[PDB]
Design a protein around this ligand. Structure first.
Ligand SMILES: Cc1cc2nc3c(=O)[nH]c(=O)nc-3n(C[C@H](O)[C@H](O)[C@H](O)COP(=O)(O)O)c2cc1C
Ligand code: FES
Length: 321
C-alpha cells in the first residue's frame, strides 16, 4: 500500500533549514498553493521519508495558518534510519507525501491557564500550543523548556526574544544530570482549572508525573515520542508466518514487520510508527518477540506484538493475521 493509496497528500518542501545542532526545520506547502487541511495545536502528521519509512512529526506553526505545515526533525544517528533519511536525502523543492493531520494532543477547552513543559525536541507540540494560546489571546501560559545548551536548543533565538521571554523559561543542564531544574516550586500549588502538558524524554515525564501526584485528576497530560531507541548491537533478519493468511515473509535487518506487511498489502492499522499509539497491536501465536514498544505491559508481552517497532528473539514468529 503506497502513501497515495493510503490517502497521503503530495506536498512540496518549500524550505529546509538547520535550526540547532542536529535539528532541521521543514516548511511544507501544497505545490499549487492550495490551502491545506486544518489542524489545531498538538496535532501530528505522518511523512513518507525518502527510504520508504513513515515517520510522525508534530506541527509547530500557528494553527490559524492555512498555507503551510512546519515540522522540526532531530537527526537520530542511533535511530532506525528514518530521521537520517529525511534529513540527509531531501532537498528544498522536493515532493514529499504527508498524511492528514491527526488531532491527538489538544489543548483543553475549559482550562483557564497552562503550564507547558518541553524537553529537547519535545518542544514541537508545546510550541504549537504556545502559538495558539497567543493567537487566541485569552488564557495565560508558562513554558518551561529544558535542553542541554543553547546550540542544541531549537527555536532558541525566537523564544529568547522580547516577544517571548516573559512566558518561557529555558534551563540548560549542560550534560550534567546533577544540574537539575526545580520542578517542585513549579508544581507545589495547583491553581484551579490549571492544566499541565508535558512532552520530553521519559525521565522528564516521570519527574513531572511524580511532582503532580497531588494535582486534580485529569489536569496533567503527556505525549511520548517513543521508546529510547533500543537497537541492541545489531538488528537481525527473522521470518514471520501469518496464521490465517497462510503466507510467510522474511523481515530483513533494516525493515520493520509493518513495512514488510504493508508491501504485501496486509492491512494493519498504524499511525505513530513509534510504538506509542497502540494501533498496530497484533496477536503473536508463537515465538519470542523482542518488544521495543511503550503500550504493552509485561502481562501481554507473550501473546501480543506492536509490529511497527518490535522484532524477534526467536528465529520465527507466527502472527494471527
Ligand atoms: C506523536 C509523535 C510526535 C513526534 N514528533 C516528533 C517531532 O516533532 N520531531 C522529531 O524529531 N521526532 C518526533 N517524533 C519521533 C519520530 O516519529 C521518530 O520516531 C524519530 O524521528 C526517530 O526515527 P528514526 O528512528 O527513524 O531515526 C514523534 C513521534 C511521535 C510518536
Ligand atoms: S503504529 Fe503506533 S504503536 Fe505501532
Amino acid at each position: 500500500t503506497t502513501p497515495q493509496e493510503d490517502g497521503f497528500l503530495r506536498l512540496k518542501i518549500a524550505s529546509k533549514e538547520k535550526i540547532a545542532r542536529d535539528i532541521w526545520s521543514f516548511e511544507l506547502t501544497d505545490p499549487q498553493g492550495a490551502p491545506l487541511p486544518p489542524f489545531e495545536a498538538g496535532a501530528n502528521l505522518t511523512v513518507a521519508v525518502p527510504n520508504g519509512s513513515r515517520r510522525t512529526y508534530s506541527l509547530c506553526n500557528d494553527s490559524q495558518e492555512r498555507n503551510r505545515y512546519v515540522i522540526a526533525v532531530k537527526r537520530d544517528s542511533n535511530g532506525r534510519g528514518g530521521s537520517i533519511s529525511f534529513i540527509d536525502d531531501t532537498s528544498e523543492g522536493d515532493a514529499v507525501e504527508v498524511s492528514l493531520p491527526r488531532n491527538e494532543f489538544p489543548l483543553d477547552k475549559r482550562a483557564k491557564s497552562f503550564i507547558l513543559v518541553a524537553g529537547g525536541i519535545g518542544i514541537t507540540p508545546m510550541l504549537s500550543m504556545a502559538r495558539q494560546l497567543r493567537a487566541e489571546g485569552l488564557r495565560s501560559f508558562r513554558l518551561y523548556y529544558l535542553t542541554r545548551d543553547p546550540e542544541g536548543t531549537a527555536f532558541f533565538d525566537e523564544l529568547t526574544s522580547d516577544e517571548w521571554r516573559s512566558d518561557v523559561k529555558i534551563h540548560h543542564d549542560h550534560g550534567d544530570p546533577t544540574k537539575a531544574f526545580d520542578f517542585w516550586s513549579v508544581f507545589e500549588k495547583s491553581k484551579p482549572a490549571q492544566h499541565v502538558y508535558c512532552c520530553g524524554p521519559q525521565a522528564l515525564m516521570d519527574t513531572v508525573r511524580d511532582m503532580t501526584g497531588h494535582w486534580p485528576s485529569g489536569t496533567v497530560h503527556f505525549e511520548s515520542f517513543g521508546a529510547t531507541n533500543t537497537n541492541a548491537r545489531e538488528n537481525t533478519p527473522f521470518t514471520v508466518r501469518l496464521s490465517r493468511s497462510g503466507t510467510s515473509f522474511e523481515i530483513p535487518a533494516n525493515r520493520s514487520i509493518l513495512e514488510v506487511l504493508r508491501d504485501a498489502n496486509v492491512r494493519v492499522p498504524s499511525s505513530c510508527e513509534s510504538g506509542t499509539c497502540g494501533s498496530c497491536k497484533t496477536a503473536l501465536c508463537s515465538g519470542e518477540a523482542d518488544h521495543r514498544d511503550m503500550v504493552l505491559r509485561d502481562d501481554e508481552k507473550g501473546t501480543q506484538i506492536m509490529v511497527c517497532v518490535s522484532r524477534a528473539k526467536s528465529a520465527e514468529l507466527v502472527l494471527d493475521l
